Amino acid sequence: LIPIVVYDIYSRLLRERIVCVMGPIDDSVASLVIAQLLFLQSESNKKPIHMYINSPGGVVTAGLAIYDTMQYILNPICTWCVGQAASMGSLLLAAGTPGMRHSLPNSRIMIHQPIQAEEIMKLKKQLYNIYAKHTKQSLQVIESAMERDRYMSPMEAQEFGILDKVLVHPP
Amino acid sequence: LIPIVVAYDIYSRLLRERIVCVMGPIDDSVASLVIAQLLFLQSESNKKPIHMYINSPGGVVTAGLAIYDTMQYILNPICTWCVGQAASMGSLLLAAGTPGMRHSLPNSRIMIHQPIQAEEIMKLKKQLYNIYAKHTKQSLQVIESAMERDRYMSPMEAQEFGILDKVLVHPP
Amino acid sequence: LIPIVVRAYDIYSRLLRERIVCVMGPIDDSVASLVIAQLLFLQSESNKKPIHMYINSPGGVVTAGLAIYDTMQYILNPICTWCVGQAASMGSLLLAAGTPGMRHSLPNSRIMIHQPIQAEEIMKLKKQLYNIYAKHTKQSLQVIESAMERDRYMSPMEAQEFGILDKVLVHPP
Amino acid sequence: LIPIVYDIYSRLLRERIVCVMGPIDDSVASLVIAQLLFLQSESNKKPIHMYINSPGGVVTAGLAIYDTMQYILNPICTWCVGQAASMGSLLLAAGTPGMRHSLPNSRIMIHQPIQAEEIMKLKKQLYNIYAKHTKQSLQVIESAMERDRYMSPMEAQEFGILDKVLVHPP
Amino acid sequence: PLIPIVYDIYSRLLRERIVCVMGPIDDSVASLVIAQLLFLQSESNKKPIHMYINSPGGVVTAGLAIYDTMQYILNPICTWCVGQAASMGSLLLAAGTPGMRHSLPNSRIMIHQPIQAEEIMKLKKQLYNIYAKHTKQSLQVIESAMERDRYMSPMEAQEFGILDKVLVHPP
Amino acid sequence: PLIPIAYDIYSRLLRERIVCVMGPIDDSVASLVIAQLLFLQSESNKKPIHMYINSPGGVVTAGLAIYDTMQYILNPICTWCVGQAASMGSLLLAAGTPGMRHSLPNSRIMIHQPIQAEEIMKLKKQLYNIYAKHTKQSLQVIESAMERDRYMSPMEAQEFGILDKVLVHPP
Amino acid sequence: PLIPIVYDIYSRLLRERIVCVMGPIDDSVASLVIAQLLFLQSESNKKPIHMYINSPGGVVTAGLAIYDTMQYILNPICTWCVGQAASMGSLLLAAGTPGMRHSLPNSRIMIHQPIQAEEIMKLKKQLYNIYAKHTKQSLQVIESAMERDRYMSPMEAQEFGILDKVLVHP
Amino acid sequence: LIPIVYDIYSRLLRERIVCVMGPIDDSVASLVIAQLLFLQSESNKKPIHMYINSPGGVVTAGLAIYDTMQYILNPICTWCVGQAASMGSLLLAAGTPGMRHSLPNSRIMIHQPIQAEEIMKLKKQLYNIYAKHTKQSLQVIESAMERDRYMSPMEAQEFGILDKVLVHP
Amino acid sequence: LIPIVYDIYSRLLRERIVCVMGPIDDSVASLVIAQLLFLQSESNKKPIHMYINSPGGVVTAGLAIYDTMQYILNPICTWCVGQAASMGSLLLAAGTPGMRHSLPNSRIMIHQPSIQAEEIMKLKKQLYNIYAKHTKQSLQVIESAMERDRYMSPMEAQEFGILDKVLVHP
Ligand SMILES: CC[C@H](C)[C@H]1C(=O)N(Cc2cccc3ccccc23)C[C@@H]2N(C(=O)NCCCC(F)(F)F)CCC(=O)N12
Ligand SMILES: CC[C@H](C)[C@H]1C(=O)N(Cc2cccc3ccccc23)C[C@@H]2N(C(=O)NCCCC(F)(F)F)CCC(=O)N12
Ligand SMILES: CC[C@H](C)[C@H]1C(=O)N(Cc2cccc3ccccc23)C[C@@H]2N(C(=O)NCCCC(F)(F)F)CCC(=O)N12
Ligand SMILES: CC[C@H](C)[C@H]1C(=O)N(Cc2cccc3ccccc23)C[C@@H]2N(C(=O)NCCCC(F)(F)F)CCC(=O)N12
Ligand SMILES: CC[C@H](C)[C@H]1C(=O)N(Cc2cccc3ccccc23)C[C@@H]2N(C(=O)NCCCC(F)(F)F)CCC(=O)N12
Ligand SMILES: CC[C@H](C)[C@H]1C(=O)N(Cc2cccc3ccccc23)C[C@@H]2N(C(=O)NCCCC(F)(F)F)CCC(=O)N12
Ligand SMILES: CC[C@H](C)[C@H]1C(=O)N(Cc2cccc3ccccc23)C[C@@H]2N(C(=O)NCCCC(F)(F)F)CCC(=O)N12
Ligand SMILES: CC[C@H](C)[C@H]1C(=O)N(Cc2cccc3ccccc23)C[C@@H]2N(C(=O)NCCCC(F)(F)F)CCC(=O)N12
Ligand SMILES: CC[C@H](C)[C@H]1C(=O)N(Cc2cccc3ccccc23)C[C@@H]2N(C(=O)NCCCC(F)(F)F)CCC(=O)N12
Ligand SMILES: [Mg+2]
């Protein structure tokens, strides 16, 4: 049951420029997030957008659709990891505007990922290049890390280049 | 949960700005909704461009062709935008946008390969060959060869092939 | 999800205000009743102004198709039929039943008159279909019978030659 | 089942009461977090009341709510009615000091009913959070969490999970 | 349903030339019955075969397959209606050797029948001709009777030409 | 569904060189029929094999597997249509040894048929050539007939070249 | 599906050195085929083994398990395609003893293929090398052909090196 | 349908071949253990051949088979055909030294696809078993088991999981 | 698929080995009890071997097997392979003193995972008394240990009195 304010709660957050990326990312979630990003951009192409991320991952092309839209719009995008960002969720976290990528202290971050053979490898290489661009790590290090079935703490994710700030309280 | 803006749900709000969404598998229900939206936008103005957002793995051939024919029939220019993917019938719709107005974002994947009686399935397949030839400007022989290859193309390859005009990282 | 336009219409209701009725998907009793109710509404708004009938359907229940057919004939309005995607089985009967001169298809549509209760009753219904197609296409009963046994689709051009429709348009005239 | 006019829960939300009920998963956590952000923007000083009746749920979803409670500036009064087990008892214990309550017949459990290394890392995060808010040593928290049992409100007060056991308002 | 052994009980009855046509008649039942008729014929093409019929009907082509095999073999076939013979069941009852078609006293018999249109009519006309042949009634009378949704007593079925003898006790 | 004796009636028929092709033809049915044809062949490569066919059709490649095995073995094969032979069932009926293709009088026979596009057409053309070979009709006539959604009587199927003899009683 | 007896019919065929590879190839099918190959080898390591193949394909590692066992045993193995051999089925067909790979005239043969990303590519490359070895075609030609979604006639498969003989009669 | 000659697996059992196929659960473990006890009583000296084609399964069921292999006196030749992942690769590695084999196209994975403390205790038992049979350090075993990947037979030989990669006898 | 030699379990039964595997319900208990009666009538002196690999099960079904083990005159050697949890560990502990074994990697749990309230407590107290009798620990220590949600290694189970011998080899 989604509560209302006199607007359902998510719509109310949307009016304050907060977009929620929650649960598994599929085509339906991607389209909704993209539609919300277009809406916020037309209200103002300068004011920051806040992206709340609590997700175990999802479909690669759906994640990439959101990724490309984030890059395409002019707005700065602050990413916030609460709970977890695994697989495509961690890619979206890392794709926030430099300096504006955040996690709360107990979140868990995973870049490991839990079609023809050639196509699955082409998509995998696209992920390598995107993580390399945003984290500043080499392709070899990205590949090694993505093969490891383990989560990182927020501090480790900061050291790796996935995020900028680990906040307990506002600054 | 579909979010609302103030009462419009997010897609209806996009529709008021002349953006139509073609998302997920294309069946008769999706085709009818898209067609109804195209008729609405045309009556508001038969000159102002229409934006078509495409993120689809494909679908039913006749439903795809219904949308295709309606796109051609209306007078408006139609800008097509590939985000995520356009496979099978999705890539046909992408290619059918107004010349010069067919776009993809940088990490999209495009497939023209295709994943009721035998004679009828071949007749539909030949209709697809002729439509791709018209809009890509490639020969029928090249279309037939390419459609037999089970693979995706990058946006740059799709541009070289004639499926789209522009690969944009940021607006122009 | 059906989109809305603003004073709140869903998109099909908005099309209905412009005299467009949609016959989409399989035709059953529920679809027939909705289409019939819409035809009665449009008639009372004006019994002279044309009605546009959008048809994209693989067919359906014979008596439900016949209910829509009879209502189309009964109202006074001219009815323009438009085949987009496909009109198979009962869908092609409705297409053929539009006002003469006002039956249209877009260029890539597919049209089928082949059809994919006690034995005597199924034959009686089949003969009613033969007579309706004969009336509207102007073909003989023998030719209708032969054609309906062939499991195939027709292009819009072939359907025009056969008498199912009048005009194949790429763009408005 | 939900009575109308605007449902009862939205009406409670207008009085700064947030409900954490049933199993805690990602969907529940997101709703609770969204409500906490709403109440904070209405006023970052006025207290928030958190009603907790829950058998527990997903660890990361519980931790997401925990972190948001700490992050906002408001004081948060926690109220245990019925039960607070597993992640539910962590949220109860995480209320503002002096403002953690239970009604008299509630049951409280800190026992907990992914790769091996990851389940242990999450378990150690829970140990440190309970130690911080209860003021008990890590060794005592670990021992208590291995015992499959519930505590009465009085026992939970003695342990440091809550501050007040009320039969009637003060 | 546990089948008792002595051979299972149906196999034991088969060794004494008794074939059972029970329940709905589909392709599987028809094949079984046909296989049994071929077996009994090879043991002796002169000795009578007893066919026990208790059936609400079934698939027309499967019924016709059994019918044609009954006619094809040389043996006399005694048909016995116990419980009921409806639709295709009553056709098989009527198709027994003349003089050898029986019912017990409380059985119920129905000739009413509870693919493209043209094909269903062609099959229906094949049924008309078969009933006319074995009952000795006109085609017009068969067609009228088959439109009536009702059962007949054994005595009425005897008068109509579906069977020869209604026995309470052996003769 | 209970077969009678375990040593069922179908195995007993197999010992007399009768193979049953019943119900929908899929890979499992084709393999069983093929295995039985190999068995009968090794018992004697001269003695005829009887193939009982009551089938609404099935998978094209499974039908073709049985077809090719029938041609490959050296035995004469008598085909018998009881009930119906539709789609791939009618192909098997037509593929019996010339002069040895039979139907009982009330059977129904259909040649109409109720993967990439190019592949479905290649298989369809293989069916055209097989029917042309065994019926002696032209490719154009086969193609026209297979588009018509209808059944044929045994007499019509005889005239068309699908079978040789329509028997009410043995010769 | 009732299996007839004489021995069930497949066991009877096994006594004449005929092994059946039918339907989708999974771990259960592979283990049965492997067990049968070990049995026939111990009866005689010289007498040929006949392998009947009618299969749309299946699990790659299960197909490779059968492949490796075929190579490992000393017996000559005659492969017979009836109906179809697609994906892993066509690999087994091609892996028969040279000169002893057969198809009946109306069979259809497909080498196109209808886990982490790196692992699926490693398995795909193992398939390329196996087809190259047994067909005598270059790796580049195998890779190009496997990307085309289409079937080959028995004659085309013979020309390609997948089989040696297309027989209408024994 | 399992063919008869004995069903085919029973026939292989009479030649001292035991099959460990598909997912390993309690039912599979009990059957394998029962077969190992049978073969041991026929002769406690003659080798036993263990065919392994398995994606893994339940840890305690794998450990039950492991302990029984060690407990009996017989030499045990392990054979990887198709794959040995997770608990399957542990059983492969637990064969008698010098008698651990793979065919050339097999895939081998030591990565693994109840309370928190208990899952770690079981994990540490696996670390010590792999260390014993491969001769690698505990630190290297731990690192390798976190990597979600398969090894070729040659890599598995270099790592100490098996002794011989044979194309032909 | 159960192999034949007798199916393999029946063959083991002829050598006085009874298998208690998987979840223990009424059906399993009745089969085990029937086997114990059979072995007893063959000889009331010769030992019986009980193989235990079980996560637990229904309390009354476990108690039925327990009572029958005590009732017959034979010595009973218990063998834990894989695991013995809940009712499984009770049966392990109930073997003849000196004849209770585990292999080295087994896991043993006496905690119960996760009828009127009074009845569930009566059954729980029956378990306390049975464990006290066979382990020789005080009932207070049994009750405390059974509240801890954890497994024991074979060595710890030996120290606790659950079993007598941890063997790597005969
Ligand atoms: C960043 C958007 C730029 C400026 C631009 C443009 O690139 N596209 C194409 C487009 C179309 C569809 C999906 C897309 C997804 C990602 C990127 C581009 C997409 C349409 C958009 N429009 C709106 O946003 N209109 C107002 C939005 C308010 C609303 F309420 F509708 F949300 C129409 C006017 C327009 O110029 N653009
Ligand atoms: C391109 C449409 C042209 C101009 C034309 C015409 O071809 N058709 C027929 C038609 C009917 C039904 C479905 C069709 C699908 C594809 C193409 C044509 C279809 C109806 C339309 N009308 C409306 O659009 N009316 C306003 C509708 C929009 C709104 F939502 F706003 F109400 C009525 C005035 C009219 O003649 N035409
Ligand atoms: C062609 C309709 C004529 C004129 C006539 C008539 O035959 N019937 C009977 C009738 C009843 C019900 C279903 C029918 C289906 C098919 C044919 C006739 C049916 C009702 C109709 N009415 C309306 O439609 N009234 C306006 C309603 C407008 C609204 F907006 F509400 F839809 C009431 C005035 C009236 O006498 N007739
Ligand atoms: C404690 C929140 C601080 C103050 C701060 C901030 O860090 N985030 C980031 C953020 C984003 C998304 C999820 C988060 C979860 C936990 C913590 C931070 C999260 C958004 C917030 N905003 C609002 O809530 N604005 C008022 C609107 C609230 C209402 F519900 F009414 F819409 C936008 C301006 C702003 O400063 N912040
Ligand atoms: C009445 C049967 C006649 C005499 C004749 C004949 O037409 N067919 C063909 C046939 C084949 C298959 C199904 C048929 C169905 C209906 C009619 C004929 C059918 C087989 C039979 N055979 C047996 O039954 N042989 C003895 C076997 C006895 C057994 F116990 F096994 F059933 C083979 C030798 C033979 O001459 N015929
Ligand atoms: C007509 C078959 C010829 C003669 C020949 C041959 O082509 N194959 C290959 C083959 C193998 C597998 C499936 C096949 C399907 C279609 C065609 C050929 C097939 C094996 C057969 N054998 C048997 O049938 N042996 C008798 C055993 C029969 C029984 F059931 F009783 F066990 C082994 C000796 C032999 O020469 N051939
Ligand atoms: C080609 C097998 C060779 C010759 C060799 C050998 O490598 N293995 C190991 C082995 C074990 C298990 C699966 C295997 C799969 C593929 C390859 C090897 C496999 C067992 C076999 N044995 C038997 O087959 N014994 C007779 C069995 C006959 C029966 F009828 F029972 F099946 C035992 C002694 C022996 O020399 N080998
Ligand atoms: C290697 C077993 C040793 C030698 C010894 C022993 O430790 N156990 C205990 C035991 C019991 C139950 C399961 C066990 C699982 C793993 C390890 C030990 C197990 C019983 C076994 N027996 C048999 O195997 N008997 C022959 C069986 C032959 C048959 F054909 F039936 F399978 C009874 C005579 C005997 O000395 N032992
Ligand atoms: C420990 C059993 C004692 C000795 C005694 C006795 O108490 N009961 C009663 C009884 C009955 C049923 C279940 C029981 C379960 C637990 C305890 C007692 C049970 C029957 C048994 N009998 C057998 O076992 N007879 C030989 C059996 C041979 C067979 F192979 F079939 F098992 C009949 C003669 C007899 O003296 N008793
Ligand atoms: Mg005793």
Q: What is the DSSP string of I23-64?
A: -B-HHHHHHHHHHHHHHHHH-SSS-EEEEEEE--B-HHHHHH
- Per DSSP, what are the bridge partners of residue B53? B21, B81
- How many contiguous H segments (helices) and E segments (strands) does chain C have? 7, 8
Q: For chain A, which chains pass the contact test of at least 3 CB pairs under 8 Å?
A: B, D, G, H
Residues of G104-139 as b/e, b for ≥16 C-beta within 10 angstroms? Answer: bbbbbbbbbbeebbbbbbbbbebbeebbbebbebee
Cα–ligand 1 centroid distance for C115 (angstroms) = 45
Give the Cα separation of B56 and A27 in Å (integer): 8
Does C139 map to a domain?
Answer: yes
Ligand 5 neighbour F52 (Cβ under 6 A)? yes
Closest Cα partner for A19 from A11, A31, A27, A8?
A11
Q: From chain B, pick out residues whose CB is under 8 angstroms from the CB of C169.
A: 73
Give resolution, Å, one decimal: 2.1
d(CA I153, CA I170): 20
Quick check: H39 and G67 in contact, CB under 8 A?
no
CB neighbours of residue F1 within 10 Å: 7
- Backbone region of residue C59 per phi and psi (left: phi > 0; alpha: psi in -120 to 50; beta: other values): left
Burial class (CB in 10 A: 0-12, 13-18, 19+), C169: middle
* CA-atom Rg of chain I in angstroms: 16
**Which of C156, C62, C40, C26 is closest to C103 using CA atoms?**
C156
Name the CA dihedral angle for F29, F32, F35, F36, rounded to a multiple of 10 degrees.
-100
Catalytic residues of F: 87, 112
The CA-based angle C74-C80-C85, given to 5 degrees, is 120
Beta strands in chain D (DSSP E): 17-21, 48-54, 76-85, 100-102, 107-109, 164-165
Distance F38 CA to ligand 6 centre (A): 6
Write out the catalytic residue numbers of B: 88, 113
Closest Cα partner for D57 from D86, D98, D33, D77?
A: D86
The yes-or-no reply on D/H contact (3 CB pairs or more, < 8 Å) is yes
Contact G123 A117 (CB under 8 A): yes
Percentage helix, strand, coil, to 5, in chain C?
A: 45, 20, 30
Nearest-atom index, ligand 6, CA of G20: 12
Residue A41 C-alpha, separation from nearest chain B C-alpha, in angstroms: 12
The residue length of chain H stands at 169
To test ligand 6's pocket by mutation, which of G11, G14, G16 has the most ligand atoms within 8 angstroms of CB? G16
Task: For residue I51, report the distance from its CA to the centre of ligand 8, in Å.
Answer: 9
Task: Reduce the DSSP state of residue E18 to 3 states and report it.
Answer: strand
DSSP designation for C60? B
The amino acid present at I130, given as its one-letter code, is: I
> What number does the ligand 6 atom closest to the CA of F37 have?
30
Nearest residue of C to residue F112 by CA position? C151
Q: Max alpha carbon distance in chain E (Å)?
A: 50
**What's the gap in Å between the CA of D105 and the closest CA on chain A?**
27
Contact between I72 and I42 under an 8 Å Cβ cutoff? The reply is no
SS3 call for H53: strand
Contact of A33 with A21, CB cutoff 8 Å: yes
Answer whether C44 contacts ligand 3 (Cβ < 6 A): yes
Chains D, A in contact, 3 or more Cβ pairs below 8 Å: yes
The number of C-alpha atoms within 13 Å of G50 and in the hemisphere containing its C-beta is 14
* Count of structural domains, chain D: 1
- CA-nearest of A158, A104, A160 to A131 is A160
Instruction: Give the type of residue at C140.
Output: S
* Nearest-5° Cα angle at E146, E144 to E148: 80
Cα A28 to Cα A51, A61, B11, B165, I111, distances in angstroms: 17, 12, 12, 27, 45
Contact predicate G72/H167, CB 8 Å = yes
Which residue has tokens 């190009």?
Answer: G144
| Beta bridge pairs of residue C55 | C23, C83
- Structure-token match 């990490």, residue found: B107
Ligand 7 centroid, distance to D100 Cα (angstroms) = 70
Interchain proximity E34–F82, CB inside 8 Å: yes
Q: Structural domain of residue G55, as residue ranges?
A: 9-166
Is any ligand 4 atom within 6 A of the Cβ of residue D37? yes
Measure the CA–CA gap between F10 and E168, rounded to whole angstroms.
Answer: 37
For D36, nearest residue in chain A (alpha carbons): A9
Task: Calculate ∠ Cα F99-F100-F103, nearest 5°.
Answer: 110
Q: Of these residues, C44, C52, C57, C89, which one is catalytic?
A: C89
Do I and C count as touching (3 or more CB pairs closer than 8 A)?
Answer: no
Q: For ligand 7, is residue G73 a contact (CB within 6 Å)?
A: yes
- The domain that contains A60 carries what CATH number? 3.90.226.10
Residue ranges of chain G whose CB lies within 8 Å of a chain B CB: 112, 147-150
Q: Tell me, rounded to whole angstroms, the distance of Cα A163 from its chain centroid.
A: 10
Q: From B141, B146, B46, B32, select the one nearest B95 (Cα to Cα).
A: B146
From chain B, the residues in CB contact with G148 under 8 A are: 148-150
Where do the DSSP E strands lie in chain A? 18-22, 49-55, 77-86, 101-103, 108-110, 165-166
Q: Which structural technique was applied? A: X-ray
Q: How many CB pairs under 8 A join F and G?
A: 89
Residue type, D105: N
DSSP letters spanning E74-104: SS-EEEEEEEEEETHHHHHHHTSPTT-EEE-
Q: Which helix (H) or strand (E) holds D32?
A: helix D26-42
Backbone angles phi, psi at G80, to 5 degrees: -130, 110
A104, C17, C43, E69, G57 from A163: Cα distances, Å = 11, 53, 64, 81, 45
CA distance B143 to G167: 37
Residue B104 lies in a domain: yes
Question: Which ligand is nearest the CA of F81, by number?
Answer: 5
Judge whether D41 lies within some domain: yes
- Within D100-162, where are the H helices? 116-134, 138-146, 153-159
Residue E171 lies in a domain: no
Q: Are A65 and A134 in contact (CB under 8 A)?
A: no
E4 lies in some domain: no
Is residue F92 a contact partner of residue F84, using CB atoms and an 8 Å limit? no
Rounded to a whole number of angstroms, the distance between the first and last alpha carbons of chain D is 32
Collect all residues of chain C within an 8 Å Cβ-Cβ radius of residue F147.
150-152
Tokens at residue B43, please? Answer: 């009556």
How far is it, in rounded angstroms, from Cα C99 to Cα C96? 9
Residue E70 CA, chain-centre distance (Å), reads: 9
Euclidean distance between CA atoms H56 and H84, whole angstroms: 7
Quickly count: other Cβ atoms within 10 Å of residue C15's Cβ.
21
- Pull the structure tokens for residue D100: 């953690």
What is the atom index within ligand 3 of the atom nearest the CA of C71? 16
Closest Cα to residue A150, out of G115, D114, G119?
A: D114
DSSP state of C97: T
How far is A79 from D88, CA to CA, in rounded Å? Answer: 27
Our answer on whether the CB atom of F34 is closer than 6 Å to any ligand 6 atom is yes
Report how far ligand 8's centroid is from the alpha carbon of H15 (Å): 20
CA gyration radius, chain F: 16
Separation of first and last alpha carbons in chain C: 34
Q: Is residue F123 part of a domain?
A: yes
> Residue with structure tokens 């060959």?
B129
Distance from CA of residue B18 to its chain's centroid?
16
Give the Cα separation of I3 and H1 in Å (integer).
14
Q: Burial letters for F21-43: b for 16+ Cβ neighbours within 10 Å, e otherwise?
A: bbbbbebebbbbbbbbbbbbbee
H or E segment to which residue B52 belongs: strand B50-56
**Among the partner residues A18, A105, A151, nearest to D67 by beta-carbon distance:** A105
H19 has which bridge partners? H51
At which residue do the structure tokens 């906490």 appear? Answer: D36
Ligand 6 mean position to B46 CA, how many Å?
A: 72
Q: Which residues of A touch B108 (CB under 8 A)?
A: 64-65, 68
CA distance B106 to B155: 6
How far lies A81's CA from each of A67, A162, A169, D63, D72, in Å?
Answer: 16, 11, 14, 12, 15
Is G4 part of a structural domain of the chain? no
Residue with tokens 């590879």: G21
CA angle F86, F91, F95 (to 5 degrees): 140
Q: Tell if the CB–CB gap between H7 and I1 is shorter than 8 Å.
A: yes
Asked, for residue H2, whether it belongs to a domain, the answer is: no
